[PDB]
Amino acid sequence: VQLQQSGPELVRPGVSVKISCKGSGYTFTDYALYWVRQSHAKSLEWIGVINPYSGNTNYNQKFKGKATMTVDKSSSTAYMELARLTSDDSAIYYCASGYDGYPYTMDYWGPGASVTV
Amino acid sequence: VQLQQSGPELVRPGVSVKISCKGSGYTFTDYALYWVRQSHAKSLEWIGVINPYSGNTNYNQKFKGKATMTVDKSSSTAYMELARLTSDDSAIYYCASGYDGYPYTMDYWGPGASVTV
Amino acid sequence: SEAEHRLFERLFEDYNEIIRPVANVSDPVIIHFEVSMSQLVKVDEVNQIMETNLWLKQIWNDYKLKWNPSDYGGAEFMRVPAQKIWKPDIVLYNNAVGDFQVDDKTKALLKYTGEVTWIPPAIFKSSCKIDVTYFPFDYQNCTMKFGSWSYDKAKIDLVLIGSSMNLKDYWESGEWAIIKAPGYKHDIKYNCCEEIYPDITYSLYIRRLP
Amino acid sequence: SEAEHRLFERLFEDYNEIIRPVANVSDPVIIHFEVSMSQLVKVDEVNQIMETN
Amino acid sequence: RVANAEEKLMDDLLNKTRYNNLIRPATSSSQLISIKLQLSLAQLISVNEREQIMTTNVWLKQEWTDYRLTWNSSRYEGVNILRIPAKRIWLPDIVLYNNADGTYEVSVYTNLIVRSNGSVLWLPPAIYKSACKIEVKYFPFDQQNCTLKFRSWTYDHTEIDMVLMTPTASMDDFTPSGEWDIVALPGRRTVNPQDP
Amino acid sequence: RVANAEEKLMDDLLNKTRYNNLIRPATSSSQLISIKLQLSLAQLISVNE
Amino acid sequence: NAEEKLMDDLLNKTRYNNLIRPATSSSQLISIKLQLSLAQLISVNEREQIMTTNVWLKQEWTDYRLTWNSSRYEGVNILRIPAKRIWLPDIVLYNNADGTYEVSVYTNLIVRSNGSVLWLPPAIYKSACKIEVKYFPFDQQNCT
Amino acid sequence: NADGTYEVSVYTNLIVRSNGSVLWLPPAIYKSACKIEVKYFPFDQQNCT
Amino acid sequence: QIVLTQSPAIMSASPGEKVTMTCSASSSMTYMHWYQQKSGTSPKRWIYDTSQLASGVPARFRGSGSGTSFSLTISSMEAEDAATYYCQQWSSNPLTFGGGTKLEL
Amino acid sequence: QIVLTQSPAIMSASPGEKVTMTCSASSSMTYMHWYQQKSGTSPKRWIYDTSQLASGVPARFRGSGSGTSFSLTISSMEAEDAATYYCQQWSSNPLTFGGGTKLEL
Ligand SMILES: *[C@@H]1O[C@H](CO)[C@@H](O[C@@H]2O[C@H](CO)[C@@H](O[C@@H]3O[C@H](CO[C@H]4O[C@H](CO)[C@@H](O)[C@H](O)[C@@H]4O)[C@@H](O)[C@H](O[C@H]4O[C@H](CO)[C@@H](O)[C@H](O)[C@@H]4O)[C@@H]3O)[C@H](O)[C@H]2NC(C)=O)[C@H](O)[C@H]1NC(C)=O
Ligand SMILES: *[C@@H]1O[C@H](CO)[C@@H](O[C@@H]2O[C@H](CO)[C@@H](O[C@@H]3O[C@H](CO[C@H]4O[C@H](CO)[C@@H](O)[C@H](O)[C@@H]4O)[C@@H](O)[C@H](O[C@H]4O[C@H](CO)[C@@H](O)[C@H](O)[C@@H]4O)[C@@H]3O)[C@H](O)[C@H]2NC(C)=O)[C@H](O)[C@H]1NC(C)=O
Ligand SMILES: *[C@@H]1O[C@H](CO)[C@@H](O[C@@H]2O[C@H](CO)[C@@H](O[C@@H]3O[C@H](CO[C@H]4O[C@H](CO)[C@@H](O)[C@H](O)[C@@H]4O)[C@@H](O)[C@H](O[C@H]4O[C@H](CO)[C@@H](O)[C@H](O)[C@@H]4O)[C@@H]3O)[C@H](O)[C@H]2NC(C)=O)[C@H](O)[C@H]1NC(C)=O
Ligand SMILES: *[C@@H]1O[C@H](CO)[C@@H](O[C@@H]2O[C@H](CO)[C@@H](O[C@@H]3O[C@H](CO[C@H]4O[C@H](CO)[C@@H](O)[C@H](O)[C@@H]4O)[C@@H](O)[C@H](O[C@H]4O[C@H](CO)[C@@H](O)[C@H](O)[C@@H]4O)[C@@H]3O)[C@H](O)[C@H]2NC(C)=O)[C@H](O)[C@H]1NC(C)=O
Ligand SMILES: *[C@@H]1O[C@H](CO)[C@@H](O[C@@H]2O[C@H](CO)[C@@H](O[C@@H]3O[C@H](CO)[C@@H](O)[C@H](O)[C@@H]3O)[C@H](O)[C@H]2NC(C)=O)[C@H](O)[C@H]1NC(C)=O
Ligand SMILES: *[C@@H]1O[C@H](CO)[C@@H](O[C@@H]2O[C@H](CO)[C@@H](O[C@@H]3O[C@H](CO)[C@@H](O)[C@H](O)[C@@H]3O)[C@H](O)[C@H]2NC(C)=O)[C@H](O)[C@H]1NC(C)=O
Ligand SMILES: *[C@@H]1O[C@H](CO)[C@@H](O[C@@H]2O[C@H](CO)[C@@H](O[C@@H]3O[C@H](CO)[C@@H](O)[C@H](O)[C@@H]3O)[C@H](O)[C@H]2NC(C)=O)[C@H](O)[C@H]1NC(C)=O
Ligand SMILES: *[C@@H]1O[C@H](CO)[C@@H](O[C@@H]2O[C@H](CO)[C@@H](O)[C@H](O)[C@H]2NC(C)=O)[C@H](O)[C@H]1NC(C)=O
Ligand SMILES: *[C@@H]1O[C@H](CO)[C@@H](O[C@@H]2O[C@H](CO)[C@@H](O)[C@H](O)[C@H]2NC(C)=O)[C@H](O)[C@H]1NC(C)=O
Ligand SMILES: *[C@@H]1O[C@H](CO)[C@@H](O)[C@H](O)[C@H]1NC(C)=O
Ligand SMILES: *[C@@H]1O[C@H](CO)[C@@H](O)[C@H](O)[C@H]1NC(C)=O
Ligand SMILES: *[C@@H]1O[C@H](CO)[C@@H](O)[C@H](O)[C@H]1NC(C)=O
Ligand SMILES: *[C@@H]1O[C@H](CO)[C@@H](O)[C@H](O)[C@H]1NC(C)=O
Ligand SMILES: *[C@@H]1O[C@H](CO)[C@@H](O)[C@H](O)[C@H]1NC(C)=O
Ligand SMILES: CN1CCC[C@H]1c1cccnc1
């Protein structure tokens, strides 16, 4: 069971960025994708949840006007696009796939991409 | 709307005392009467409630065997008698008429008699 | 209204719905009682039974459900469910089919002075006896005997409002014509029990149109 | 069992029973519907009625 | 706030002492609660012979002693009788076992009277559709014997007694039927030896 | 957890501190709630004479 | 008392659920057993083909979540519980004329230290059976 | 009505729009009670209300 | 049964300043009343049902609270506001008054 | 709506010592999860439904709590048990994690 992400990217502030998450080793439908950021102080927060079978999204109310979350049932890959990057967004971004049942946890975790702005 | 009481009285200890309260300017039925005492520490306490249409009295459990509350429906005047007066009774005595509905608040207040033991 | 919502919240914060609503315990409640008839459904001559549609107007007073109109938005009337308030058990003795209690889906009417007015509708299968010594040229007399089942004369005192049953909303029958229907208060003593129970008896006096 | 009791406790903690069960809003629920007959009790030709189980 | 004596008494009996209606008032182990009952007929209304069903309104006064429902009289400014609804306290489920329908119990459930002794009285209003057989040889010059079997479904003889008070059912509020005549109303208490 | 739009709106409308189904929607005193009704028949199933 | 403590200790909302069936593991068959007690044939209506009986259908089973030993609880070995509060199988009859499947009144039931729960409720049934009417009025009738 | 069923009919849910226009259409069978003019027969009109 | 306790006991504030007084209970209640007594006179009914102003009360004031915490709040202090404020409850037998917060200049 | 807070922030213990960590909330809840992150790598699901253990977890640990107070407990301290523990709730919108407790030797 693996999640694969992109490498670290150096983007100037004011330019939108896009990272990806591609999962293998399990049936890609019937799970759900969570996006979690982690700052340099190791105090990590939640961004949003997408369901890759239908596309229903739920964002955090802090991050509604920034993040855009899409999936793709062809290659089984989720895309996250951040806008309005400032100096307070250099962090580590994890995608985590969990079952959409009552544990409601992150069963599997990705490596984590590094955004330095 | 006016409430009249008795004047200030000097009572040697061991002697009962009777104070009065006469109301005018409103219908004397349908308002209950409350007797409220205020000490010299500004910490005022409650004695009893009488209903002048029927005489249904309800005393405070601290002051059950000391106070006697009567009415006089002909002249619209209530009487209160205190017995076995001690040194802790030199206070200000108020009669307060209020409507017996769900505010349950003292709508009108008297001048306040003064009792010195 | 906001003030009526606050009054309904204040009114039922603590209300024992099973204690009788007197200020002083040695005082009976006084239940003004009236019955109204919508129609006389049928009188079964063979089975000696009598089906009526009745409205049971009951007016009593409550010391705990009174409020001030000047402090609560000018409100003077509230509608409450019949399940939350205390209400008496007027039960007709000469019944012949089924249960005796009347249901509670209707709503009571609180006036700010404590006056509660409760109007349940009911069907009743009375069991009046008939004489067929004349037929069909006969006059028949049938009685209904309402009254509190448990409380004494010293805990419920019944009072008639009028002196007869209301025939103002009477749906005509077409077979039986009502001559008179008076109502009479009695204070009777049963041989089970050592205390006096009051009751109210109505007496329909009908005639067949032959 | 022990796991069924915890699942029943978790399952109905906050369940509004009068909101219709869709993740989105424009999505309609799809109800598969089938009826089975146990017996035909009577068909009154006089009253024109039909009693079925 | 302003409360009755009866409201304070009802607060002190049920919710203060944590009263439970599911468990019976036994002071010790293997104690028989001697409940006692007597019937009063009110009206014969139907003695239907083709369906073999009689319908009668009866008043069954059944009474016992519950030691948990006691209070002092002079503390609550004087109350000797106090009436409470029947679905809050313990009561045995004495019903008919011979009826034509399936309704054993009373579908009315009024309130009942408890005194300062602890003596509980209950007299529910009831009409019953009892089922009795018809002896129809000497029609219409015939006697009819029809019975009513009162007993409980929860408890048994090892846990409650059942004491018949008077030998005959009373005839006090009786209205004469016009068709039938009551001539005697005996009553008996049936227990089987070598069958507890 | 995850909710709908309708569940949040339902939690906002019928709130116990704000909505009560026993006091009628009168904005002031002596205001008549104009309701309107219209009967639609489906079948004359029986007329028992 | 002892019975009031035992009732609260046995039936507790954090440890007892009247909606899950008492199996120790998966694929365990709860052997419930029943027998019928007839009381009266009140009507054997022939034109509508309905027989109307009243029965005292008794049934007993083994609930392992209602077990205790006697010596803690002062010699108590029986209880009187309302039936709608614990787990019960929903045995009814199917060939009926009405929609009355279930039982009438849901009386109390007896549970012991062993875990043997025995319940005997009264029920009336309007069963529907066919009428062999080739012989009349000298006829057997088989009604199930 | 011929029965005692002055109770409300079956409690199907109702539609409320964004501006508060509350609409309710419950289904009901009714056993209405009307008098039968039976002078002409079987050539009769019936006014039942 | 419920004992009321106010905070603070003696306080003061300049004209044009927020003033906050707290009344605390032993157990929980919902509705509680507030009375004003000036120097050398009789009290007046001032706030009833925890938020509602009385008849002759200016609209500067606001009461709020629940459970075991209640608070009277003055937005615009004035020189004619120096008095003593009492909080009282009736939800539990007997009728109890507060200690009395004295507001002066 | 609910902000979690762990105690203590930095702590340490010897191998063979009882270790207790607490996670507190602003309001009440019933079910709360625990995640473990080592140095450099990705977190793992470690404890779910406040008491249960995941698949590849040794049976020495124990989570317990209710209301607004929860706790994780280590009976026998492990050599490779130097990590960072996070507590998180999904019962209130939005998904808030914990501050993190770093347990080192
Ligand atoms: C159909 O059947 C019913 C009963 O089956 C009959 O109802 C009876 O009707 C009579 C006639 O009105 C009723 O008798 C009246 O009772 C009144 C109440 O009595 C109380 O008060 C008296 C006086 O203190 C007490 O002695 C008594 O114990 C009660 O406490 C009386 O006030 C009436 O008296 C009036 O008439 C007499 C003359 O007869 C005058 O002298 C009196 O001053 C007074 O004006 C009267 O006696 C009787 O109570 C009803 N019974 C029931 C059970 O309801 C119907 O009459 C019958 N219909 C027909 C057409 O016959
Ligand atoms: C109206 O109809 C009812 C219904 O039938 C009649 O009720 C009957 O009443 C009589 C007495 O009046 C009952 O007769 C009694 O039967 C008892 C049962 O015997 C049992 O024991 C034997 C073993 O020896 C078993 O084989 C048998 O099956 C029974 O289980 C007897 O025990 C009674 O004996 C009497 O004397 C002895 C000795 O003194 C006493 O110990 C007893 O208590 C008892 O007094 C007696 O013979 C009869 O059972 C009732 N019928 C039913 C169905 O129960 C009414 O009498 C009738 N009304 C009128 C006016 O006739
Ligand atoms: C009162 O009335 C009832 C109602 O009819 C009778 O009960 C029936 O009795 C008969 C036999 O007496 C039962 O018939 C049984 O049929 C089984 C096969 O039927 C099934 O399979 C076919 C397809 O093969 C389906 O079409 C059908 O719908 C069924 O699903 C046999 O297997 C039975 O054989 C028995 O014996 C063999 C040994 O040779 C065993 O191995 C079997 O397991 C089985 O025990 C049998 O022949 C019938 O099922 C009963 N019920 C019904 C609803 O009809 C009563 O008999 C009657 N009472 C009296 C006294 O007559
Ligand atoms: C089917 O059957 C129904 C029921 O029988 C019929 O309904 C009746 O219809 C007529 C007319 O449509 C109604 O008559 C109206 O009565 C009103 C009230 O009457 C008052 O006066 C009488 C004494 O004359 C009192 O007994 C009574 O209690 C009232 O106090 C009148 O106000 C009506 O007048 C109309 O015109 C005037 C101006 O002239 C207006 O100001 C009025 O507002 C009103 O519009 C009228 O006279 C009668 O009440 C109805 N019900 C009954 C029970 O009879 C249907 O007509 C019938 N349909 C068919 C097709 O046959
Ligand atoms: C409390 O308990 C006492 C018992 O000590 C009750 O007194 C009893 O009351 C009943 C009826 O109220 C009396 O019964 C009557 O007996 C006579 C005897 O001839 C009979 O003719 C009557 O028809 C009736 O059945 C009984 O005698 C009496 N005494 C005893 C010793 O039982 C009392 O009523 C109870 N209640 C209160 C409030 O005190
Ligand atoms: C708890 O459960 C056990 C069974 O696991 C009970 O033991 C059984 O008890 C019953 C009732 O006493 C016995 O039934 C009897 O059988 C005889 C056979 O002749 C019959 O004549 C009787 O009328 C009665 O039906 C049964 O034999 C006995 N044994 C078994 C294996 O069931 C036990 O009584 C229960 N009580 C406790 C507290 O354990
Ligand atoms: C807000 O409230 C207004 C009225 O207060 C609602 O508007 C009304 O909507 C109905 C249908 O939903 C319209 O009825 C139709 O009108 C045509 C006109 O010829 C008629 O032929 C049709 O048979 C049908 O009855 C109605 O005209 C319209 N306006 C008014 C003044 O009643 C409206 O639906 C509510 N909701 C929203 C979201 O606006
Ligand atoms: C509910 O479904 C509708 C359509 O099925 C979704 O609307 C689409 O949303 C995507 C994502 O922003 C847009 O790119 C499309 O233009 C929308 N319209 C279409 C397909 O007609 C809607 O987003 C769904 N609701 C939620 C909460 O996801
Ligand atoms: C209930 O009513 C009774 C009688 O109406 C009240 O008892 C009276 O109390 C007054 C008080 O001074 C005495 O003067 C009378 O002599 C008493 N009368 C009797 C007959 O006892 C009783 O006080 C009332 N209850 C309450 C709570 O006030
Ligand atoms: C008093 O007892 C009744 C009976 O069940 C109960 O409904 C009520 O909540 C109790 N009151 C309190 C304050 O617990
Ligand atoms: C009831 O109370 C009074 C006064 O408190 C007391 O004298 C009397 O003994 C009490 N009754 C009993 C049975 O103790
Ligand atoms: C509405 O409901 C919420 C749900 O908890 C409650 O907290 C609030 O007090 C209610 N009233 C208002 C006016 O928000
Ligand atoms: C259920 O059991 C727990 C622990 O055994 C106990 O704390 C709780 O009080 C019990 N429930 C009741 C209602 O007593
Ligand atoms: C009953 O249970 C207690 C506690 O588990 C135990 O000490 C005792 O031995 C048991 N008695 C038996 C099994 O007879
Ligand atoms: C008046 N009720 C009807 C007849 C008996 C009487 C009564 C007596 C005691 C308890 N309940 C009812």
Read off the CATH number of the domain in which G140 is found.
Answer: 2.70.170.10
- Measured between beta carbons, which residues in chain C are less than 8 angstroms from residue E108? 99-101
Quote the number of domains for chain J: 1
Considering CB atoms only, which of C10, C23, C112 is closest to B54?
C23
Strand partners, C188: C197
Nearest residue to H35 (alpha-carbon basis) of C204, C39, F45:
C39
Number of alpha carbons in the 13 Å side-chain half-sphere of residue A65? 2
Residue whose entry in the numeric block shows the structure tokens 């919108």: J93
d(CA C129, CA C46): 10
d(CA C91, CA H15): 41
Using alpha carbons only, give the angle J26, J29, J35 rounded to the nearest 5 degrees. 90
- Cβ(E120)–Cβ(E113) below 8 Å: yes
The reply to whether ligand 3 has any atom less than 6 angstroms from the CB of G27 is no
Work out whether strand B9-10 and strand B113-116 pair parallel, antiparallel, or are unpaired. Answer: parallel
Considering CB atoms only, which of H2, H3, H7 is closest to C105?
H7
Nearest residue to E59 (alpha-carbon basis) of E113, E127, E114:
E127
Helix H, strand E, coil C: the string for chain G is CHHHHHHHHHCCCCCCCCCCCCCCCCCCCCCCEEECCEEEEEECCCCCCEEEEEECCEEEEECCCCCCCHHHCCCCCECCECHHHCCCCCCCCCCECCCCCCCCCCCCEEEECCCEEEECCCEEEEEECCCCCCCCCCCCCCCC
Burial of G138 (0-12, 13-18, 19+ CB in 10 A): exposed
> Who contacts J40 (Cβ-Cβ below 8 Å, separation ≥6)?
none
- Cβ(A75)–Cβ(A28) below 8 Å: no
Expressed in angstroms and rounded, the spacing between residue G100 Cα and the centre of ligand 3 is 27
The DSSP output letter for H14 is: -
> How many Cβ atoms from other residues are within 10 Å of residue J67's Cβ?
11
**Helices and strands: H and E segment counts in chain E:** 1, 9
Sign for the CA dihedral angle at A101, A102, A107, A111 comes to positive
Strand partners, C183: C202
Chain C, nearest residue to F24 by Cα: C1
Sign for the CA dihedral angle at I4, I8, I12, I16 comes to negative
Q: F15-36: b or e for each residue (b if 16 or more CB lie within 10 Å)?
A: eeeeeeeebeeeeeeeeeeeee
Considering CB atoms only, which of B54, B56, B102 is closest to C68?
B102
**Token pair in block for residue E126:** 């009831």
| C84/chain B closest Cα distance in angstroms | 18
The reply to whether ligand 2 has any atom less than 6 angstroms from the CB of E143 is no
d(CA J71, CA J7): 9
Q: Is residue D26 less than 8 Å (CB to CB) from chain F?
A: no
- Supply the residue whose CA is at minimum distance from atom 4 of ligand 14: G72
- Supply the residue whose CA is at minimum distance from atom 12 of ligand 15: C150
- Cβ(B75)–Cβ(B6) below 8 Å: no
Using alpha carbons only, give the angle C61, C67, C69 rounded to the nearest 5 degrees. 125
d(CA I93, CA I89): 9
**Token pair in block for residue I33:** 């009343």
J30 with D6: Cβ contact below 8 A:
no
| E13/chain B closest Cα distance in angstroms | 21
d(CA G22, CA G115): 11
d(CA J47, CA I23): 44
F22 with C1: Cβ contact below 8 A:
no
Method: cryo-EM
- Supply the residue whose CA is at minimum distance from atom 7 of ligand 6: G114
Q: Is residue D2 less than 8 Å (CB to CB) from chain J?
A: no
d(CA F47, CA F45): 7
Residue G81 Rama label (left phi>0; alpha psi -120 to 50; beta): beta
Which of G3, G52, G79, G126 to probe the E interface (max E CBs under 10 A)? G3
d(CA C70, CA B71): 27
Nearest residue to D18 (alpha-carbon basis) of C81, H14, H9, H7:
H14
- Cβ(E51)–Cβ(E100) below 8 Å: yes
Amino acid at A96: A
> How many Cβ atoms from other residues are within 10 Å of residue A113's Cβ?
20
Nearest residue to E18 (alpha-carbon basis) of B66, H3, I2, G8:
G8
C24 with B56: Cβ contact below 8 A:
yes
The reply to whether ligand 3 has any atom less than 6 angstroms from the CB of G142 is yes
Nearest residue to B74 (alpha-carbon basis) of B56, B98, B52:
B52
**Token pair in block for residue G1:** 């008392």
d(CA G107, CA G122): 8
Beta strands in chain A (DSSP E): 2-5, 9-10, 17-24, 31-38, 44-50, 57-59, 67-70, 77-82, 91-99, 108-109, 113-116
**What is the arrangement of strands in the sheet containing I61-74, beginning at the earlier edge strand?**
I5-7, I19-29, I61-74
d(CA I63, CA E69): 45
- Cβ(J105)–Cβ(J11) below 8 Å: no
**Token pair in block for residue I84:** 């003593």
Q: Which domain holds residue I17?
A: 1-105
d(CA E62, CA E38): 7
**Token pair in block for residue E149:** 């079997």
**Helices and strands: H and E segment counts in chain A:** 0, 11
Cα J33 to Cα G133, J22, J53, J95, J100, distances in angstroms: 71, 13, 10, 11, 13
Q: Where are the domains of chain A?
A: 1-117
- Measured between beta carbons, which residues in chain D are less than 8 angstroms from residue G99? 53
d(CA A60, CA A47): 5
Burial of E186 (0-12, 13-18, 19+ CB in 10 A): exposed
- Cβ(A23)–Cβ(A34) below 8 Å: no
- Cβ(E126)–Cβ(E108) below 8 Å: yes
Amino acid at A52: P
H46 with F47: Cβ contact below 8 A:
yes
Q: Which ligand 12 atom is the nearest neighbour of the CA of F17?
A: 11
Cα C3 to Cα C6, C111, C118, D46, I59, distances in angstroms: 5, 15, 24, 59, 18
D22 with F5: Cβ contact below 8 A:
no
CATH number at residue C108: 2.70.170.10
Expressed in angstroms and rounded, the spacing between residue G72 Cα and the centre of ligand 14 is 7
Chain C, nearest residue to I51 by Cα: C6
Phi, psi of E180 (to 5 degrees): -110, 165
d(CA E41, CA E39): 6
The reply to whether ligand 8 has any atom less than 6 angstroms from the CB of D24 is yes
- Cβ(J63)–Cβ(J34) below 8 Å: yes
Peptide bond into E176 cis (omega under 30): no
Beta strands in chain H (DSSP E): 15-16, 22-23
- Measured between beta carbons, which residues in chain C are less than 8 angstroms from residue F18? 5
Quote the number of domains for chain G: 1
Q: Which ligand is nearest to the CA of B56?
A: 9
C1 with F23: Cβ contact below 8 A:
yes
The reply to whether ligand 4 has any atom less than 6 angstroms from the CB of H47 is yes
Resolution in A: 3.3
The reply to whether ligand 7 has any atom less than 6 angstroms from the CB of H20 is no
